[PDB]
C-alpha cells in the first residue's frame, strides 16, 4: 500500500533516474534483469511502493519518461539498470525542445501529453493506494521545465487530495547553462506554487564544491554528482519502506513543513560525507552528524542560512541509533543558534527516526532545510529578469508561439509577492 | 471474574503495548505461543483447549507498526481479528485524526469490542493507551472517546496518555493536537495519567546508569505503572484497590482529571546491591521532584488528593510510619480542604524483571499516583506555545481544508482558559 | 426406514450436487466405489451384495456436465440409468425449457422416479435443486412441478433454488426466467430456500480470507446447509426435526414459501484457533446481517418465524440462554402477531470437512433458516428490471417464436404484482 507513481522529464530528468534507481535497486538487491537476490525478508516487506509484482517472480519500477527527443531514452536502455524499465513507458516526442518554455509547454506539450496521462491512469488503477506523485526535473532547460508543469496541472485537477513533489534543479548563480534561463525559471516557477505541495531546491553550483571541498574528488562526473541526488530522495522514503521506532513518510513531512501553503521551498542536505583518503580517521557518531549538516557548505542549494532564519527543520535518521543522543543534539541546536530560527513557532524540530542504515555505512541522516535564505536566489532570478525583459530581449520567439506580455507582468509580480512574504515573515516579533 | 479490555491507539499505543503484553507474558507463565506447561480470567479468555488470548484491540492508521506484531515473537498469540489497519495514516493532522480518515474505521473497531464484551461479565473499564503529539493518538482517540460514552458509558475508562514534553518536540504541530483533544475528552474522559518522556531521559541516565536509551527501553519503565494499578486485579493483595474507585479517590471537581505517575525503585542491577530499600527509604523518594515522570515540579503547586500502590514485602505498620513521616514536612504541602487525600492499596506478589531488560529483581516495589495543582503552570506554557502560533494563522490551511471550520479553534481555546483558570480557582484556599 | 429423494436440474442442478454427495460419502464411510471396509437407509440403497447406490436423479439438457461424472472420480456409484441427458440444451430460453425441449424428457424422467419409490417406504419428500436464471433450471423445472404435484402430491417438496443476485449478472434474460418460473412456482411448491451467489464471495473473502473462488469452492459451503436440514433423518438427535415440519413452522400464509438459509461459523483453519466458538458467540453471527448468503439487507424488514438448527456439542440450557438475549435486542424485530417463532432442533454429530476443503473442522455449528419479509425489496427491484426490459419489447421474439403466447407475460406479471403487496398486507401490524 501507498504507491508513488516516479515521473521524469528533461534531458536532466532522465539520467538522474539512471542513478536514482540503480540505488533503490541496491537497497533490495536487484539485479539489471529484474529478478531478486536479497539475503533478508526485511527487503521484500515494502516492495511494492517502488515496483508492480510482475509475472516470473520479476519488479519493474513504477517508472514513467518523459522527453521530446529520443536523444536520451535510447541511452538510458544502453547502459546499467536500463534493462528493468519497461520498454512500454518511454513516452517521447520526435522532434525535440530546442530548449524553450513555450515550444515545452505549448507547441509539442499539447500532442504528448495524452499519451502520458493515460499512462499515468494506467498506473493509477495499477496502485492499490495511491500515496502521491514525484517529478525529477530541471527549470532551465525546455523539456523540464515546462513539460514537467504541464504534467502538474493536469494531475492536481485530475488527484486534488494526492501529494506531490518535484526534485527539480534550479540554475547555479553565476555561472550559466542556459542563456534564456532567467525565462526558464520565473515562467516555470509561477506554474509550481500553483499546484505543487513542496519541492527541493538542489542547485549544480553547490554540489560541485560538495564534491570538491569535501569529498575531494579530482574528476567529479554525473556518476557521482547525480549519486548525492539520489541519496536525499532516498533519504526521505526510507521510513515509508522500513519499520522504524518513528515513522514518517511524505505527508508528515508536508504537514510539519509548510506553515503557509505558498512557503514550501525548501532545502537538502546529506551527512556523513567522508572521502577515500578521509575516513579512517572521524568519529562515526550522532553528534559528528548534526554540526556537520548546518553549515553552509553542506546545503545543497546556493544559499547562506548566516543571512536568514530557518522556520521547519526536518531531520530523517537511518540506523540502529539511540533517541537521547539525537533529542539532546536537536536541543542543543537550537539554543545556540537561538538567533538562526524563527521566534513565533517553538521548537521547530522535525525527528524521524528509521532502523535501516544505506548499505555501505553504518548510520547516516537526511537533511531537509526550509529557511528565508532563498530570497536571494529568487531575486537574483528576478533581477536578470527585470533587466532582460525591459530590452524586450529574446522576446520574440515566445511570443511567436503565442504567449502576450501579460503572461509575463503576472508572472513576474507573482515572484516579487512570493518574496514579500519571505521578508515578512524573517524578521517579525 | 472481572475483566479490564484494552485498547490501543497509533503508533505510541503498539509500541508501549506489545512492552505492556510481554510483561503479562512473563507472570502467568504464558509462553510466546499462549500455552502454559485460576487468576488470569481479568485480562486472558481461555479457548475450548488449553491455548489463551490478550484482550487486547490494537488499532493504527499505519500499518508499519502493526505487521511487526503479525511476523515477530508474538505472531501466533493475537487473533488476527483484532489487529484492524487501514491504508493511509493520519500523519499528524487531528482533521485526518477525527474528520477525513477516522470516519472510516471507527465503526470497525467497535464491532470487535462489543464481542469481547459478549464473552465477559465482569467488564470493569477500559485502557486506552495513545499519545497526544501524534495526530492519530489524538483524532482517531477523540473520536473513540464519544462512542464509547454512548455504548457504555458507566465502564470507568483510562488513559495512559503520553504529555507532550515542554522542551523536547519531535513534531512541530504538537501545540495543536494537544489542545484540540483536550476539549474533546473533557467531556468524555475520566482519569487520565501523564506520563513524559523528559524525565525519563532524566531519571534513566541518573538512575539506571545508562546515557542512550531507546523507545523499547523506555518502555520497559512504562510497563511498571501498568502492572502496578492493574495489580489488584490479577493478584489477590492485603489492601485491594478497584478501578472505579480511582475516579472517586482522586477526582474532586468533573472538570480536572489530570493526575500523574510516579515509580520507585528505579536502581541499575550492579547498583541493586549495597541497600536494603526499606520502606521509608523508597516512599522518601516518591516525593521528590527530581524521580517523578513527568518535568513538573510539585513543590510551586500543592496536592489534592493523593494515591499509594504497593506490591512485594508490605507491612501495614511500615506504611503507616511513612506516611506520617511525610505529612509533617513542609516540601509537600497539601490543600487545605483535604487532610484524608490518601487511598493506599497492598499487593502481595513483587514486580518481576523481564529477562535482558534493565531493572533489577528487588523484594518491593511502589508506584505512586498523586493529583497535582504544579502541572498548570506546564499548561500555561503550552497554551502560550499555542497564542503564537495561531495568532499567526500558521499551518491553519492544512485543517480548514480538510474537513474543519476554523471557528472550532475559538471553542477549543476559550475552555482552555477556562480550566486554565480552574486550577487559580482550587489551588488558593478558602477565605479564614 | 424414512427415505427422501433428490433431484438435481441443469447445471446448477450437477455441480452443486457433485458436492454435496462427496460430503455423503465421507460421512458414512462410503468409498468412491461404494464399499464400507445401519443409518444410511434414507439416502443410500442397498443392492443384493455389499454395494450401495446414492437416491440421486441427475437431469439436464445439455451434455457436458453430466459426463465429467461419468468419467470422473465417481464412475463407478452412479446407476447409469440415472444420468439423463438430451441432445440440444435450452441454451437460457423458457420456452427450450418449458414448451419446446423439456416436452420431450419430462415422461422420461418420472420413470426412473416412481422406481426410486417402489423400493422405499418412508418417501418424505423430495429435494429440487437448481437456478433461476438458466433456463433449464427454470423451465425444466416449472414443468416438473405439475407432475410431481399430479402424481405424488402429499410429499413435502422443496427447494435450494439459486435466487438471481441484485448486482452481479451472468445471463441477460435473468429478468425473464426468474419471473415466469414464479408464476408456476408458486401453484405446486411448497417451500423455497434460496442461496444466493454474491453474498457467499462477501463472505468467503471476509471469513475465509480467500480472495478468489471457484464454483467448486463456492458449492463447498452450499452442502453445509445439505447436510444441516437433513441432518435429523440420518443421524438421531437429541431434538429431532422433520421435512414435513418445515412446511408448517415456516410457512405461515400459502402464498409466501420464500424463507433463506445461513450458516455459522464459517472461518479458516488458521483462524479455527484463538476463540472457543461458544453458543452464544456463534448465534449472533447468525443475525448479523454481514454473514448471510441473500443479499437481503433484514433490518429493513421483519421476520415472520425463524428456525435455528443445531449440529455438535449442543447443550440445551446453553440454547435457550443464546435465543432470549436475541428476543431481547432492537436490530431484530419481528411481525407482531408471531411471539413463538422458532422451532429449534438438535443434532449430536458435528459436520465434518472434506480433505483438501476450505472450512475447519469444529466442535459445533449452525444452519440457521429464517423467513423474512425484507426481500420483496429484492422482488420490487427485479421486477424494476422487468418493467424496461418488456416495456421495450426486448426478446421477446426469441420466445413468441418458440411456442409462447405473449399474453402469458400479461398473466404472470400481475400475479407478481400481487405477491409484490402481499408482503405489504402482511409486513404491516394490525389496528391497535
Ligand atoms: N515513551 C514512548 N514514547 C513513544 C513511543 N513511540 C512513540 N512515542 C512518542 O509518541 C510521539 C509521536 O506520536 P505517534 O503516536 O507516533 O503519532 P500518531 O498518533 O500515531 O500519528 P501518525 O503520524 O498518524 O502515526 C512522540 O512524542 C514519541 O516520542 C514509545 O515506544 N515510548
Ligand atoms: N453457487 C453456484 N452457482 C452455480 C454453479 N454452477 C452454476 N451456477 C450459477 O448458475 C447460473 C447459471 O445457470 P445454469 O444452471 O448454468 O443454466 P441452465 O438452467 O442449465 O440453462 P442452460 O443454458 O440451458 O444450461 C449462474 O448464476 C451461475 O453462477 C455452482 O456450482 N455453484
Ligand atoms: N545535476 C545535473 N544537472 C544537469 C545535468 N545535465 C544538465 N543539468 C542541468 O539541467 C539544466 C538544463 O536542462 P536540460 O535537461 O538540458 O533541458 P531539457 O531537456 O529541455 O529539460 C541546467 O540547469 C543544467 O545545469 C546533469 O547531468 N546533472
Not at chain 1, 525478508?41 to 511502493?49: S, Y
Not at chain 1, 536537536?330 to 521547530?348: A, D, G, T
Not at chain 2, 524483571?353 to 502541572?375: E, F, H, W, Y
Request: aromatic fraction near 10%; charge should be negative.
Amino acid at each position: 500500500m501507498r504507491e508513488i507513481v516516479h515521473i521524469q522529464a528533461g534531458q536532466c530528468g532522465n539520467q538522474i533516474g539512471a542513478k536514482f534507481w540503480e540505488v533503490i535497486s541496491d537497497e533490495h538487491g536487484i539485479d539489471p534483469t529484474g529478478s531478486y537476490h536479497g539475503d533478508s525478508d526485511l527487503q521484500l516487506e515494502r516492495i511494492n511502493v517502488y515496483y508492480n509484482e510482475a509475472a516470473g517472480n520479476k519488479y519493474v519500477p513504477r517508472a514513467i519518461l518523459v522527453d521530446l527527443e529520443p536523444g536520451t531514452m535510447d541511452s538510458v536502455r544502453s547502459g546499467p539498470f536500463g534493462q528493468i524499465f519497461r520498454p512500454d513507458n518511454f513516452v517521447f516526442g520526435q522532434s525535440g525542445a530546442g530548449n524553450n518554455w513555450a515550444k515545452g509547454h505549448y507547441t509539442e506539450g499539447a500532442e504528448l501529453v495524452d499519451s502520458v496521462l493515460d499512462v499515468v491512469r494506467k498506473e493509477s488503477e495499477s496502485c492499490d493506494c495511491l500515496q502521491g506523485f514525484q517529478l525529477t526535473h530541471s527549470l532551465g532547460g525546455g523539456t523540464g521545465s515546462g513539460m514537467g508543469t504541464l504534467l502538474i496541472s493536469k494531475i492536481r485537477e485530475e488527484y486534488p487530495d494526492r501529494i506531490m513533489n518535484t526534485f527539480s534543479v534550479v540554475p547555479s548563480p553565476k555561472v550559466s547553462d542556459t542563456v534564456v534561463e532567467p525565462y526558464n525559471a520565473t515562467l516555470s516557477v509561477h506554474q509550481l506554487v500553483e499546484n505543487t505541495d513542496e519541492t527541493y531546491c538542489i542547485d549544480n553550483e553547490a554540489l560541485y564544491d560538495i564534491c570538491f571541498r569535501t569529498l575531494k574528488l579530482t574528476t567529479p562526473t554525473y556518476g557521482d554528482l547525480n549519486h548525492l541526488v539520489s541519496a536525499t530522495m532516498s533519504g526521505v522514503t526510507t521510513c515509508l519502506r522500513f519499520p522504524g521506532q518513528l515513522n514518517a513518510d511524505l505527508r508528515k513531512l508536508a504537514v510539519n513543513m509548510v506553515p503557509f501553503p505558498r512557503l514550501h521551498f525548501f532545502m537538502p542536505g546529506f551527512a556523513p560525507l567522508t572521502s577515500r583518503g578521509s575516513q579512517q580517521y572521524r568519529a562515526l557518531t550522532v553528534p559528528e552528524l548534526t554540526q556537520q549538516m548546518f553549515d553552509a557548505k553542506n546545503m545543497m542549494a546556493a544559499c547562506d542560512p548566516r543571512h536568514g532564519r530557518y522556520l521547519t527543520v526536518a531531520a530523517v535518521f537511518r540506523g540502529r541509533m539511540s533517541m537521547k543522543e539525537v533529542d539532546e543534539q536537536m536541543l542543543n541546536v537550537q539554543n545556540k543558534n537561538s538567533s538562526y530560527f524563527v521566534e513565533w513557532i517553538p521548537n521547530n524540530v522535525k525527528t524521524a527516526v528509521c532502523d535501516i542504515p544505506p548499505r555501505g555505512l553504518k548510520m547516516s541522516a537526511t537533511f531537509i532545510g526550509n529557511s528565508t535564505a532563498i530570497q536571494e536566489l529568487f531575486k537574483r532570478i528576478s533581477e536578470q529578469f527585470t533587466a532582460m525583459f525591459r530590452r524586450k530581449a529574446f522576446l520574440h520567439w515566445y511570443t511567436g508561439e503565442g504567449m502576450d506580455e501579460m503572461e509575463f507582468t503576472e508572472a513576474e509580480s507573482n515572484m516579487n509577492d512570493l518574496v514579500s512574504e519571505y521578508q515578512q515573515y524573517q524578521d517579525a516579533t | 471474574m472481572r475483566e479490564c479490555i484494552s485498547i490501543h491507539v497509533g503508533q505510541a499505543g503498539v509500541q508501549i503495548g506489545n512492552a505492556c503484553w510481554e510483561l503479562y507474558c512473563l507472570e502467568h507463565g504464558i509462553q510466546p505461543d499462549g500455552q502454559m506447561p485460576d487468576s488470569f480470567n481479568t485480562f486472558f479468555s481461555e479457548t475450548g483447549a488449553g491455548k489463551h488470548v490478550p484482550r487486547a484491540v490494537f488499532v493504527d492508521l499505519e500499518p508499519t507498526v502493526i505487521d511487526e506484531v503479525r511476523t515477530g515473537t508474538y505472531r501466533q498469540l493475537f487473533h488476527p481479528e483484532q489487529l484492524i489497519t487501514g491504508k493511509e495514516d493520519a500523519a499528524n493532522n487531528y482533521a485526518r485524526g477525527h474528520y477525513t480518515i477516522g470516519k472510516e474505521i471507527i465503526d470497525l473497531v467497535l464491532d470487535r469490542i462489543r464481542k469481547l464484551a459478549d464473552q465477559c461479565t465482569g467488564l470493569q473499564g477500559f485502557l486506552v493507551f495513545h499519545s497526544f503529539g501524534g495526530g492519530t493518538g489524538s483524532g482517531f482517540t477523540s473520536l473513540l472517546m464519544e462512542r464509547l460514552s454512548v455504548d457504555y458509558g458507566k465502564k470507568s475508562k483510562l488513559e495512559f496518555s503520553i504529555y507532550p514534553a515542554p522542551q523536547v518536540s519531535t513534531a512541530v504541530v504538537e501545540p495543536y493536537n494537544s489542545i484540540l483533544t483536550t476539549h474533546t475528552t473533557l467531556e468524555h474522559s475520566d482519569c487520565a495519567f501523564m506520563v513524559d518522556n523528559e524525565a525519563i531521559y532524566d531519571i534513566c541516565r541518573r538512575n539506571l546508569d545508562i546515557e542512550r536509551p531507546t523507545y523499547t527501553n523506555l518502555n520497559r519503565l512504562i510497563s511498571q505503572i501498568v502492572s502496578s494499578i492493574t495489580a489488584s486485579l490479577r493478584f489477590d493483595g492485603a489492601l485491594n484497590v478497584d478501578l472505579t474507585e480511582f475516579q472517586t479517590n482522586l477526582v474532586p471537581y468533573p472538570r480536572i482529571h489530570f493526575p500523574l505517575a510516579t515509580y520507585a525503585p528505579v536502581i541499575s542491577a550492579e547498583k541493586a546491591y549495597h541497600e536494603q530499600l526499606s520502606v521509608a527509604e523508597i516512599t522518601n523518594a516518591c516525593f521528590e521532584p527530581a524521580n517523578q515522570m513527568v518535568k513538573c515540579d510539585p513543590r510551586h503547586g500543592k496536592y489534592m488528593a493523593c494515591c499509594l500502590l504497593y506490591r512485594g514485602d508490605v507491612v501495614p505498620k511500615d506504611v503507616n510510619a511513612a506516611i506520617a513521616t511525610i505529612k509533617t514536612k513542609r516540601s509537600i504541602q497539601f490543600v487545605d480542604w483535604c487532610p484524608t487525600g490518601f487511598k493506599v492499596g497492598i499487593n502481595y506478589q513483587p514486580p518481576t524483571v523481564v529477562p535482558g531488560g534493565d531493572l533489577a529483581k528487588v523484594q518491593r516495589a511502589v508506584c505512586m499516583l498523586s493529583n497535582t495543582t504544579a502541572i498548570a503552570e506546564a499548561w500555561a506554557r503550552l497554551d502560550h506555545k499555542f497564542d503564537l502560533m495561531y495568532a499567526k494563522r500558521a499551518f491553519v490551511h492544512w485543517y480548514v481544508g480538510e474537513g474543519m471550520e476554523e471557528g472550532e479553534f475559538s471553542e477549543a481555546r476559550e475552555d482552555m482558559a477556562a480550566l486554565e483558570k480552574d486550577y487559580e480557582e482550587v489551588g488558593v484556599d478558602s477565605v479564614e
